[PDB]
Amino acid sequence: DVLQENQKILAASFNKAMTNIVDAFTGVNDAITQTSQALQTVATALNKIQDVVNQQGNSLNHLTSQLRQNFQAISSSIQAIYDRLDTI
Amino acid sequence: DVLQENQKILAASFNKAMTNIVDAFTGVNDAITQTSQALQTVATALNKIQDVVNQQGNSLNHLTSQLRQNFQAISSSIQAIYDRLDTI
Amino acid sequence: DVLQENQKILAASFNKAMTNIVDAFTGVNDAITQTSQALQTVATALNKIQDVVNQQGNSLNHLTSQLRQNFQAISSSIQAIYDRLDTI
Amino acid sequence: GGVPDLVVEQYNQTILNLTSEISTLENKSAELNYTVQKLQTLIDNINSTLVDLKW
Amino acid sequence: GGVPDLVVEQYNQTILNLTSEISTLENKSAELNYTVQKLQTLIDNINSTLVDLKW
Amino acid sequence: GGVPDLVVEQYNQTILNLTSEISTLENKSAELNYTVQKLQTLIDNINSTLVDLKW
């Protein structure tokens, strides 16, 4: 009987296919989980980078201000020195 | 009739399987879309980081140059002061 | 015969479904490969960022130390100048 | 000699702003996690379709 | 007293170079988007295979 | 005149530490690559199930 034999073949193929499709979707789902974790990891890294880079920007900004004030003080002090030397 | 009954079972299983496979591939496709968007987002972030970090590197480079010149000026000025003090 | 005809329909549908499922998993697998490569790329980028950002932090740290020492030297030198001016 | 010419140029700070990118990546991670949960049920559904036929 | 010893060391700037990584991520994002388009058609094809049998 | 008041404040260096994140991304990349290898075999298995029936 070709109908019974064909049905046997089709049932075996369907079950093998579904077993492998289940396994393949399970592997894909593991990949999606790994990707989700990786994206959280990248977000955390970006937050750390933003933090430290802007702290260093702040530090440069403040150092430039301190330096401008220190050099202005030096200029005034040396000006007074040269004025007194000119009086002497 | 076992052939008709088995065919009914196999057809119901095939249709349920395909419906769920369609839904699962649709969910996977949504995940791939989200990942594509995330990768563009990371590329944009890296471009911003590269920009700001190299600007801060440039700033440090230029500040070191300005400082070297300012301290050379101070050294020369103080040298002249000490020379005049030695003449006095 | 409805059994033979239904079997023909079911076999054609099964084969079309499996062909497209194979193609779809192949496309998903390409996407997973691309994502794996992208995650390696992000790891490399983070390593570069960590390197350069901490070098710039080191540079700022060391520049602040050099500056403190240079300004202390200037303070002492100018102190001696004003002491000699007061003696004169 | 004379007073030294001391110049320190004005610093113009560019801010690194990654807030939108960080939020986007957090949202994408959450979307993928939800999808994982939905896909587990779909996988179970497919697994339930295996046939146990007799002839 | 004397002239102060003032030293500022030479600065050696390391450049952060992410151009290759940025391009790579842009390309990967484009590849995934194209795959999404192809997969939609494949999903429709699978959906078309549902059988409507009568006995 | 007088001695200038020169002050340079203590610098407190925050270290950017991405070592855990880098390792995590390397591990995730390796996991996905292994999954790709396993999925290729599963795809071949599904492809082997096509039927060649005669009536």
CSV table of C-alpha atoms in Angstrom, one decimal:
chain,number,residue,atom,x,y,z
A,1,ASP,CA,0.0,0.0,0.0
A,2,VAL,CA,1.6,3.2,-1.1
A,3,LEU,CA,-0.7,5.4,1.0
A,4,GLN,CA,0.3,3.8,4.3
A,5,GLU,CA,4.0,3.8,3.3
A,6,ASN,CA,3.9,7.4,2.2
A,7,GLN,CA,2.2,8.3,5.4
A,8,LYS,CA,4.9,6.5,7.4
A,9,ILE,CA,7.6,8.4,5.5
A,10,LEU,CA,5.9,11.8,5.9
A,11,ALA,CA,5.3,11.2,9.7
A,12,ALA,CA,9.0,10.2,10.2
A,13,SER,CA,10.2,13.3,8.3
A,14,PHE,CA,7.8,15.6,10.1
A,15,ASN,CA,9.0,14.4,13.5
A,16,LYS,CA,12.7,14.6,12.6
A,17,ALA,CA,12.1,18.1,11.2
A,18,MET,CA,10.2,19.3,14.3
A,19,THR,CA,12.9,17.9,16.6
A,20,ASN,CA,15.6,19.7,14.8
A,21,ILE,CA,13.5,22.9,14.5
A,22,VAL,CA,13.0,22.9,18.2
A,23,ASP,CA,16.7,22.4,18.8
A,24,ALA,CA,17.5,25.2,16.3
A,25,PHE,CA,15.1,27.7,17.8
A,26,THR,CA,16.5,26.8,21.2
A,27,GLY,CA,20.0,27.6,20.0
A,28,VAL,CA,18.8,30.9,18.4
A,29,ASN,CA,17.1,31.8,21.7
A,30,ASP,CA,20.4,31.2,23.5
A,31,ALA,CA,22.0,33.6,21.0
A,32,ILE,CA,19.3,36.2,21.7
A,33,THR,CA,19.9,35.9,25.4
A,34,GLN,CA,23.7,36.3,24.9
A,35,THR,CA,23.1,39.4,22.7
A,36,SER,CA,20.7,40.9,25.3
A,37,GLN,CA,23.4,40.5,28.0
A,38,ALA,CA,26.0,42.0,25.7
A,39,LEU,CA,23.9,45.0,25.0
A,40,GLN,CA,23.5,45.7,28.7
A,41,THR,CA,27.3,45.3,29.1
A,42,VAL,CA,27.8,47.9,26.3
A,43,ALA,CA,25.4,50.3,28.0
A,44,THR,CA,27.3,49.9,31.3
A,45,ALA,CA,30.6,50.5,29.5
A,46,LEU,CA,29.3,53.7,27.8
A,47,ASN,CA,28.1,55.0,31.1
A,48,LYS,CA,31.5,54.5,32.6
A,49,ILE,CA,33.2,56.1,29.6
A,50,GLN,CA,30.9,59.1,29.7
A,51,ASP,CA,31.7,59.5,33.4
A,52,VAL,CA,35.4,59.4,33.2
A,53,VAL,CA,35.8,61.4,30.0
A,54,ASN,CA,33.7,64.3,31.3
A,55,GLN,CA,35.6,64.2,34.6
A,56,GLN,CA,38.8,64.6,32.6
A,57,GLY,CA,37.2,67.4,30.6
A,58,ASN,CA,36.2,69.1,33.9
A,59,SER,CA,39.7,68.7,35.2
A,60,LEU,CA,41.3,70.3,32.1
A,61,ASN,CA,38.8,73.1,32.3
A,62,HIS,CA,39.6,73.8,36.0
A,63,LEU,CA,43.4,73.4,35.5
A,64,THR,CA,43.2,76.0,32.7
A,65,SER,CA,41.5,78.4,35.1
A,66,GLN,CA,44.0,77.8,38.0
A,67,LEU,CA,46.9,78.3,35.5
A,68,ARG,CA,45.5,81.5,34.2
A,69,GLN,CA,45.2,82.8,37.8
A,70,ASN,CA,48.6,81.6,38.8
A,71,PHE,CA,50.3,83.2,35.8
A,72,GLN,CA,48.4,86.5,36.4
A,73,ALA,CA,49.7,86.5,40.0
A,74,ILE,CA,53.3,85.9,38.6
A,75,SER,CA,52.9,88.7,36.1
A,76,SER,CA,51.8,91.2,38.8
A,77,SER,CA,54.6,90.1,41.2
A,78,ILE,CA,57.3,90.4,38.6
A,79,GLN,CA,55.8,93.8,37.5
A,80,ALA,CA,56.3,95.1,41.1
A,81,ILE,CA,59.8,93.7,41.1
A,82,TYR,CA,60.7,95.5,37.9
A,83,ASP,CA,59.1,98.8,39.1
A,84,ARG,CA,61.3,98.6,42.3
A,85,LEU,CA,64.4,97.8,40.2
A,86,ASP,CA,63.6,100.9,38.1
A,87,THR,CA,63.3,103.0,41.2
A,88,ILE,CA,66.6,101.7,42.5
B,1,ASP,CA,-9.9,3.9,9.1
B,2,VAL,CA,-6.4,4.4,10.5
B,3,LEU,CA,-5.1,6.1,7.3
B,4,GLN,CA,-7.8,8.9,7.4
B,5,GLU,CA,-7.4,9.3,11.2
B,6,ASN,CA,-3.6,9.5,11.0
B,7,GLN,CA,-3.8,12.0,8.1
B,8,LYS,CA,-6.2,14.1,10.3
B,9,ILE,CA,-3.7,14.0,13.2
B,10,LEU,CA,-0.7,14.8,10.9
B,11,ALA,CA,-2.5,17.7,9.2
B,12,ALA,CA,-3.5,19.2,12.6
B,13,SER,CA,0.1,18.9,13.9
B,14,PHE,CA,1.6,20.4,10.7
B,15,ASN,CA,-0.7,23.4,10.9
B,16,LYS,CA,-0.1,24.0,14.6
B,17,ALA,CA,3.7,23.6,14.0
B,18,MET,CA,3.7,26.0,11.1
B,19,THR,CA,1.7,28.6,13.0
B,20,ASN,CA,4.1,28.5,15.9
B,21,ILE,CA,7.1,28.5,13.6
B,22,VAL,CA,5.8,31.6,11.8
B,23,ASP,CA,5.3,33.3,15.2
B,24,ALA,CA,8.8,32.2,16.3
B,25,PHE,CA,10.6,33.5,13.2
B,26,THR,CA,8.6,36.7,13.6
B,27,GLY,CA,9.9,37.1,17.1
B,28,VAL,CA,13.5,36.3,16.0
B,29,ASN,CA,13.1,38.9,13.2
B,30,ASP,CA,12.1,41.5,15.8
B,31,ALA,CA,15.2,40.6,17.8
B,32,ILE,CA,17.4,41.0,14.7
B,33,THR,CA,15.8,44.4,14.0
B,34,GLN,CA,16.5,45.5,17.6
B,35,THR,CA,20.1,44.2,17.3
B,36,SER,CA,20.6,46.1,14.0
B,37,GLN,CA,19.4,49.3,15.7
B,38,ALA,CA,21.6,48.7,18.7
B,39,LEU,CA,24.7,48.2,16.5
B,40,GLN,CA,24.0,51.6,14.8
B,41,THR,CA,23.7,53.1,18.3
B,42,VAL,CA,27.0,51.7,19.3
B,43,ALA,CA,28.7,53.0,16.2
B,44,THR,CA,27.3,56.5,16.9
B,45,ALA,CA,28.6,56.3,20.5
B,46,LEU,CA,32.1,55.3,19.4
B,47,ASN,CA,32.2,58.2,16.9
B,48,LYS,CA,31.3,60.6,19.7
B,49,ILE,CA,33.8,59.1,22.1
B,50,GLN,CA,36.6,59.2,19.4
B,51,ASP,CA,35.7,62.9,18.8
B,52,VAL,CA,35.8,64.0,22.5
B,53,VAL,CA,38.8,61.9,23.6
B,54,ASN,CA,40.9,63.2,20.7
B,55,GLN,CA,39.8,66.8,21.4
B,56,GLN,CA,41.0,66.3,25.0
B,57,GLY,CA,44.2,64.8,23.8
B,58,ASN,CA,44.7,67.9,21.5
B,59,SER,CA,43.9,70.2,24.5
B,60,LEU,CA,46.5,68.5,26.7
B,61,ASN,CA,49.1,68.7,23.9
B,62,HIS,CA,48.5,72.4,23.3
B,63,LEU,CA,48.4,73.1,27.1
B,64,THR,CA,51.8,71.5,27.5
B,65,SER,CA,53.2,73.7,24.7
B,66,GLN,CA,51.7,76.9,26.2
B,67,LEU,CA,53.1,76.0,29.6
B,68,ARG,CA,56.6,75.3,28.2
B,69,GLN,CA,56.5,78.7,26.6
B,70,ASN,CA,55.2,80.5,29.7
B,71,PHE,CA,57.8,78.9,31.9
B,72,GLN,CA,60.5,79.8,29.5
B,73,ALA,CA,59.4,83.4,29.6
B,74,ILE,CA,59.4,83.3,33.4
B,75,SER,CA,62.9,81.9,33.5
B,76,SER,CA,64.2,84.6,31.2
B,77,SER,CA,62.5,87.4,33.1
B,78,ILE,CA,63.8,86.1,36.5
B,79,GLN,CA,67.3,85.7,35.0
B,80,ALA,CA,67.3,89.4,34.0
B,81,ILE,CA,66.1,90.3,37.5
B,82,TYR,CA,68.9,88.3,39.2
B,83,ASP,CA,71.5,89.8,36.8
B,84,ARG,CA,70.4,93.3,37.8
B,85,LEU,CA,70.4,92.4,41.5
B,86,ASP,CA,74.0,91.2,41.0
B,87,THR,CA,74.9,94.5,39.4
B,88,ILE,CA,73.3,96.4,42.3
C,1,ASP,CA,-9.6,9.5,-3.7
C,2,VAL,CA,-9.5,12.1,-1.0
C,3,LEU,CA,-6.8,10.4,1.0
C,4,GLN,CA,-4.3,10.3,-1.9
C,5,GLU,CA,-5.1,13.9,-2.8
C,6,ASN,CA,-4.8,15.1,0.8
C,7,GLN,CA,-1.5,13.3,1.1
C,8,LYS,CA,-0.2,15.0,-2.1
C,9,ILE,CA,-1.2,18.4,-0.7
C,10,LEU,CA,0.3,17.7,2.7
C,11,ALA,CA,3.6,16.5,1.1
C,12,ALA,CA,3.9,19.6,-1.1
C,13,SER,CA,3.2,21.9,1.8
C,14,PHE,CA,5.7,20.1,4.0
C,15,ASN,CA,8.4,20.3,1.4
C,16,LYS,CA,7.7,24.0,0.7
C,17,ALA,CA,7.7,24.8,4.4
C,18,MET,CA,10.9,22.9,5.1
C,19,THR,CA,12.7,24.6,2.2
C,20,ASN,CA,11.7,28.0,3.5
C,21,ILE,CA,12.5,27.1,7.1
C,22,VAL,CA,16.0,26.0,6.0
C,23,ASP,CA,16.5,29.3,4.2
C,24,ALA,CA,15.2,31.3,7.2
C,25,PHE,CA,17.4,29.5,9.7
C,26,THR,CA,20.3,30.1,7.3
C,27,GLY,CA,19.5,33.8,7.3
C,28,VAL,CA,19.2,33.9,11.1
C,29,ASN,CA,22.6,32.1,11.3
C,30,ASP,CA,24.1,34.8,9.1
C,31,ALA,CA,22.7,37.4,11.5
C,32,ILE,CA,24.2,35.6,14.5
C,33,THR,CA,27.6,35.5,12.7
C,34,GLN,CA,27.4,39.2,12.0
C,35,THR,CA,26.4,39.9,15.7
C,36,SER,CA,29.3,37.8,16.9
C,37,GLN,CA,31.8,39.8,14.8
C,38,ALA,CA,30.2,43.0,16.0
C,39,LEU,CA,30.6,42.0,19.6
C,40,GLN,CA,34.3,41.3,19.1
C,41,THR,CA,34.6,44.7,17.4
C,42,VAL,CA,33.0,46.4,20.4
C,43,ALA,CA,35.4,44.6,22.7
C,44,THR,CA,38.3,45.8,20.7
C,45,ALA,CA,37.0,49.4,20.7
C,46,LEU,CA,36.5,49.4,24.5
C,47,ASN,CA,40.0,48.2,25.0
C,48,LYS,CA,41.3,51.0,22.9
C,49,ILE,CA,39.2,53.5,24.7
C,50,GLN,CA,40.3,52.3,28.1
C,51,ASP,CA,43.9,52.5,27.0
C,52,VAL,CA,43.8,56.1,25.7
C,53,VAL,CA,41.5,57.5,28.4
C,54,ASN,CA,43.7,56.2,31.2
C,55,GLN,CA,46.8,57.5,29.4
C,56,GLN,CA,45.2,60.9,29.3
C,57,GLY,CA,44.3,60.6,33.0
C,58,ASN,CA,47.9,59.7,33.7
C,59,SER,CA,49.1,62.7,31.7
C,60,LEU,CA,46.8,65.1,33.6
C,61,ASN,CA,48.0,63.6,36.9
C,62,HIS,CA,51.7,64.0,36.0
C,63,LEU,CA,51.1,67.5,34.6
C,64,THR,CA,49.5,68.6,37.8
C,65,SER,CA,52.6,67.3,39.7
C,66,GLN,CA,55.1,69.0,37.4
C,67,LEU,CA,53.1,72.3,37.7
C,68,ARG,CA,53.0,72.1,41.5
C,69,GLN,CA,56.8,71.7,41.5
C,70,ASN,CA,57.4,74.5,38.9
C,71,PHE,CA,55.2,76.9,40.8
C,72,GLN,CA,56.9,76.0,44.1
C,73,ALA,CA,60.2,76.8,42.5
C,74,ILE,CA,58.9,80.2,41.2
C,75,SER,CA,57.6,81.0,44.7
C,76,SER,CA,61.0,80.4,46.3
C,77,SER,CA,62.9,82.3,43.6
C,78,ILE,CA,60.6,85.3,43.9
C,79,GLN,CA,60.8,85.1,47.7
C,80,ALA,CA,64.6,85.4,47.5
C,81,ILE,CA,64.2,88.3,45.1
C,82,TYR,CA,61.9,90.2,47.4
C,83,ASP,CA,64.2,89.5,50.4
C,84,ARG,CA,67.1,91.0,48.5
C,85,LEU,CA,65.0,94.0,47.5
C,86,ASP,CA,64.1,94.5,51.1
C,87,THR,CA,67.8,94.4,52.1
C,88,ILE,CA,68.6,97.0,49.3
D,1,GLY,CA,64.6,92.5,30.9
D,2,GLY,CA,60.9,92.9,31.5
D,3,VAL,CA,57.7,91.4,32.7
D,4,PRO,CA,57.0,88.1,30.9
D,5,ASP,CA,54.2,87.7,28.4
D,6,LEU,CA,52.1,84.9,30.0
D,7,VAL,CA,49.1,83.6,28.0
D,8,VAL,CA,46.8,80.7,28.7
D,9,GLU,CA,44.1,80.4,26.2
D,10,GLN,CA,40.4,80.0,27.0
D,11,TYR,CA,39.4,76.3,27.3
D,12,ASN,CA,36.2,75.3,25.5
D,13,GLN,CA,35.0,72.0,26.9
D,14,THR,CA,33.1,69.6,24.6
D,15,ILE,CA,30.8,67.4,26.7
D,16,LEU,CA,30.6,63.7,25.8
D,17,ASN,CA,26.8,63.0,25.8
D,18,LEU,CA,25.9,59.3,25.6
D,19,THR,CA,22.6,59.4,27.5
D,20,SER,CA,20.4,58.7,24.5
D,21,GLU,CA,22.7,55.8,23.4
D,22,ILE,CA,22.8,54.3,26.9
D,23,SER,CA,19.0,54.4,27.2
D,24,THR,CA,18.6,52.9,23.7
D,25,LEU,CA,20.9,50.0,24.5
D,26,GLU,CA,19.1,49.4,27.8
D,27,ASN,CA,15.7,49.4,25.9
D,28,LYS,CA,17.0,47.0,23.2
D,29,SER,CA,18.4,44.6,25.9
D,30,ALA,CA,15.0,44.6,27.6
D,31,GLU,CA,13.2,44.0,24.3
D,32,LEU,CA,15.4,41.0,23.5
D,33,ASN,CA,14.9,39.5,27.0
D,34,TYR,CA,11.1,39.7,26.6
D,35,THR,CA,11.4,38.1,23.1
D,36,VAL,CA,13.4,35.2,24.7
D,37,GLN,CA,10.5,34.6,27.1
D,38,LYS,CA,7.9,34.6,24.3
D,39,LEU,CA,10.1,32.3,22.1
D,40,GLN,CA,10.4,29.7,24.9
D,41,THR,CA,6.7,29.2,24.9
D,42,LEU,CA,6.6,29.0,21.1
D,43,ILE,CA,9.4,26.3,21.2
D,44,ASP,CA,7.3,24.3,23.6
D,45,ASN,CA,4.3,24.6,21.3
D,46,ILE,CA,6.3,23.3,18.3
D,47,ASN,CA,7.7,20.5,20.5
D,48,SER,CA,4.1,19.5,21.4
D,49,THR,CA,3.2,18.7,17.7
D,50,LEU,CA,5.3,15.5,17.4
D,51,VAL,CA,3.0,12.7,16.2
D,52,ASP,CA,2.7,9.2,17.7
D,53,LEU,CA,1.0,7.3,14.9
D,54,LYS,CA,0.3,3.6,14.6
D,55,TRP,CA,-0.5,1.5,11.6
E,1,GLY,CA,68.5,82.6,45.6
E,2,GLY,CA,68.6,81.9,41.9
E,3,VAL,CA,66.6,81.4,38.7
E,4,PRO,CA,64.1,78.6,39.2
E,5,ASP,CA,64.6,75.3,37.4
E,6,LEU,CA,61.4,75.0,35.4
E,7,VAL,CA,60.7,71.8,33.4
E,8,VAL,CA,57.6,70.7,31.5
E,9,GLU,CA,58.1,67.4,29.8
E,10,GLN,CA,57.3,66.7,26.1
E,11,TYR,CA,53.8,65.4,25.7
E,12,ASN,CA,53.3,62.4,23.5
E,13,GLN,CA,49.7,62.2,22.3
E,14,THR,CA,48.2,58.7,21.6
E,15,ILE,CA,45.4,59.1,19.1
E,16,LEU,CA,42.2,57.1,19.8
E,17,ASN,CA,41.5,55.5,16.4
E,18,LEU,CA,38.0,53.8,16.1
E,19,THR,CA,37.4,54.4,12.4
E,20,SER,CA,37.6,50.7,11.5
E,21,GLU,CA,35.4,49.7,14.4
E,22,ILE,CA,32.8,52.3,13.5
E,23,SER,CA,32.7,51.3,9.9
E,24,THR,CA,32.4,47.6,10.9
E,25,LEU,CA,29.5,48.2,13.2
E,26,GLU,CA,27.7,50.3,10.5
E,27,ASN,CA,28.2,47.4,8.0
E,28,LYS,CA,27.0,44.8,10.4
E,29,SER,CA,23.9,46.9,11.2
E,30,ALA,CA,23.2,47.2,7.4
E,31,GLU,CA,23.7,43.4,6.9
E,32,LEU,CA,21.2,42.6,9.7
E,33,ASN,CA,18.6,45.1,8.3
E,34,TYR,CA,18.9,43.4,4.9
E,35,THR,CA,18.4,40.0,6.5
E,36,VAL,CA,15.3,41.2,8.2
E,37,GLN,CA,13.8,42.1,4.8
E,38,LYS,CA,14.6,38.7,3.4
E,39,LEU,CA,13.3,36.9,6.5
E,40,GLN,CA,9.9,38.6,6.2
E,41,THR,CA,9.4,37.1,2.8
E,42,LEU,CA,10.5,33.7,4.1
E,43,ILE,CA,8.0,33.9,7.0
E,44,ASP,CA,5.2,34.7,4.6
E,45,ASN,CA,6.2,31.7,2.5
E,46,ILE,CA,6.0,29.4,5.5
E,47,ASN,CA,2.7,30.9,6.5
E,48,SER,CA,1.3,30.1,3.0
E,49,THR,CA,1.8,26.3,3.5
E,50,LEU,CA,-1.0,25.8,6.0
E,51,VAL,CA,-3.3,23.1,4.7
E,52,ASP,CA,-7.1,23.2,4.4
E,53,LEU,CA,-8.0,19.6,4.0
E,54,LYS,CA,-11.5,18.0,4.0
E,55,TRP,CA,-12.4,14.3,4.6
F,1,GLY,CA,54.4,94.0,45.8
F,2,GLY,CA,55.0,90.6,47.2
F,3,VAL,CA,55.5,86.9,46.5
F,4,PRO,CA,52.6,85.5,44.4
F,5,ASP,CA,50.1,83.1,45.9
F,6,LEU,CA,50.4,80.0,43.6
F,7,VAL,CA,48.1,77.1,44.1
F,8,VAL,CA,47.6,74.0,42.1
F,9,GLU,CA,45.0,71.7,43.6
F,10,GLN,CA,45.6,67.9,44.1
F,11,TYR,CA,44.5,65.9,41.2
F,12,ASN,CA,42.3,62.8,41.9
F,13,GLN,CA,42.5,60.4,39.0
F,14,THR,CA,39.4,58.3,38.3
F,15,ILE,CA,40.5,55.1,36.4
F,16,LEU,CA,38.3,53.9,33.6
F,17,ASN,CA,37.9,50.2,34.2
F,18,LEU,CA,36.4,48.2,31.3
F,19,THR,CA,38.1,44.9,31.9
F,20,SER,CA,35.0,43.0,33.0
F,21,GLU,CA,33.0,44.4,30.1
F,22,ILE,CA,35.7,43.6,27.6
F,23,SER,CA,35.9,40.0,28.8
F,24,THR,CA,32.1,39.7,28.8
F,25,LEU,CA,31.9,40.8,25.2
F,26,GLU,CA,34.7,38.4,24.2
F,27,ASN,CA,32.8,35.6,25.9
F,28,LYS,CA,29.5,36.5,24.2
F,29,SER,CA,31.1,36.6,20.8
F,30,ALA,CA,32.6,33.2,21.4
F,31,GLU,CA,29.3,31.8,22.5
F,32,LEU,CA,27.5,33.1,19.4
F,33,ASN,CA,30.2,31.6,17.1
F,34,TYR,CA,29.8,28.2,18.7
F,35,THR,CA,26.0,28.4,18.3
F,36,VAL,CA,26.5,29.2,14.6
F,37,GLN,CA,28.4,25.9,14.2
F,38,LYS,CA,25.7,24.0,16.0
F,39,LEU,CA,22.9,25.6,14.0
F,40,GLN,CA,24.6,24.7,10.6
F,41,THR,CA,24.3,21.0,11.5
F,42,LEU,CA,20.7,21.5,12.6
F,43,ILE,CA,19.9,23.2,9.3
F,44,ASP,CA,21.4,20.4,7.4
F,45,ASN,CA,19.3,17.9,9.4
F,46,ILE,CA,16.1,19.8,8.6
F,47,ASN,CA,17.1,19.9,4.9
F,48,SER,CA,17.4,16.2,5.0
F,49,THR,CA,13.7,15.7,5.8
F,50,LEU,CA,12.3,16.7,2.4
F,51,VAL,CA,10.2,13.8,1.1
F,52,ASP,CA,10.3,12.2,-2.4
F,53,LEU,CA,6.9,10.5,-2.5
F,54,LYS,CA,5.3,8.7,-5.5
F,55,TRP,CA,1.7,7.8,-6.1
